[PDB]
Design a protein around this ligand. Structure first.
Ligand SMILES: O=C(N[C@H](CO)c1ccc(F)c(Cl)c1)N1CCc2cnc(NC3CCOCC3)nc2C1
Length: 328
């Protein structure tokens, strides 16, 4: 029992300790008696909502297929032996010490640590994008860190196959104005800016405020930037806004490495067609001390209908996907 909730994971997993909770789940750390290490166990109860069932199936299917040092994996999955009895699914994963959200609230990151965290985010992102997948929800709380500065990207609930919410501070401007892999690069740019000054770069208070924070730093879009906004009302809205001059990156970040600001500028490009791509970002001079393309793997197979399936069919798909972890 954990805080009035049943966590039926044993006998392999013992000594449970509460970590946190979400809308349809609870995370605990536990001791794995087979591997002799503490693990993270997420109890998820999504079967009453369509959206939660989609998030659950996406995370399970994607994470079981992915295998990369900078992406959290799934070690084990616990659920009931019959569909009717299955109310919750327990997802067992590597236990991480902290996340980038917590780290940025408490520590001053050295230029070497910022460089190394950005490198690992992009290294994992290279793999995700080579699988034709968009994470779509990159933010500091989804970047797990261990004692040795190793980083893993987690929470693939909103991930989707490329076809070209607690915070919107990391969402690309085209999401409002209109998506490509370029939406993840924007979120990485926001994270880099946050690592440089320990504060979110575009902390919008409401929906339209998010774009105002973006334009307040980037400046008003150029004529070419505007021409690429196809939607009539969104272009008229952009034209109606007061004029803004670009804030130079070194005024906002006077202590940052000029090479980090050059990369930041390319990731936080208003026009997604002109935004830097993951392989180009890895090869940027800011990351030269870690860049090693022979040690930056790609997915063996591109990843491959859910947004219209009912919750009852998604539960069957979740049951089928988890079957190989059940006893004989
Ligand atoms: O999938 C998640 N988290 C996502 C974040 O949105 C999530 C989803 C549903 C939820 F219901 C909650 Cl609550 C959290 N994981 C699994 C893997 C793991 C491994 N280790 C640590 N360790 C903690 C130690 C304390 O600092 C933070 C990391 N956490 C985690 C969280």
């Amino acid at each position: 029992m954990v805080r009035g909730q049943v966590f039926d994971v044993g006998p392999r997993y013992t000594n449970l300790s509460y970590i946190g909770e979400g809308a349809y789940g609870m995370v605990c750390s536990a001791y794995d008696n087979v591997n002799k290490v503490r693990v993270a166990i997420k109890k998820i109860s999504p079967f009453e909502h369509q959206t939660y069932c989609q998030r659950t199936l996406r995370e399970i299917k994607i994470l079981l297929r992915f295998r990369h040092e900078n992406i959290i994996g799934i070690n084990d999955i616990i659920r009931a032996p019959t569909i009717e009895q299955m109310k919750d699914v327990y997802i067992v994963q590597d236990l991480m010490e902290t996340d980038l959200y917590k780290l940025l609230k408490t520590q001053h990151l050295s230029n070497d640590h910022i460089c190394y965290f950005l490198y690992q985010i992009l290294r994992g992102l290279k793999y995700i994008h080579s699988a034709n997948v968009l994470h779509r929800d990159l933010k500091p709380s989804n970047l797990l860190l261990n004692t040795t500065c190793d980083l893993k990207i987690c929470d693939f609930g909103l991930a989707r196959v490329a076809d070209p919410v607690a915070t919107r501070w990391y969402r690309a401007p085209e999401i409002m104005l209109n998506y490509t892999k370029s939406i993840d690069i924007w979120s990485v740019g926001c994270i880099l800016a946050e690592m440089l000054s320990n504060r979110p770069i575009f902390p919008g208070k409401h929906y339209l405020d998010q774009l105002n924070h973006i334009l307040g730093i980037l400046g008003s879009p150029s004529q070419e930037d505007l021409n690429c906004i196809i939607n009539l009302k969104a272009r008229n809205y952009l034209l109606s806004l007061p004029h803004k001059n670009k804030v130079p990156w070194n005024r906002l970040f006077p202590n940052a490495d000029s090479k980090a600001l050059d990369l930041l500028d390319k990731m936080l490009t208003f026009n997604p067609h002109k935004r830097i791509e993951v392989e180009q970002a890895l090869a940027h001079p800011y990351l030269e001390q870690y860049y090693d393309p022979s040690d930056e793997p790609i997915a063996e197979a591109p990843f491959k209908e859910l947004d219209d399936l009912p919750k009852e069919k998604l539960k069957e798909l979740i049951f089928e996907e988890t079957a190989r972890f059940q006893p004989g």
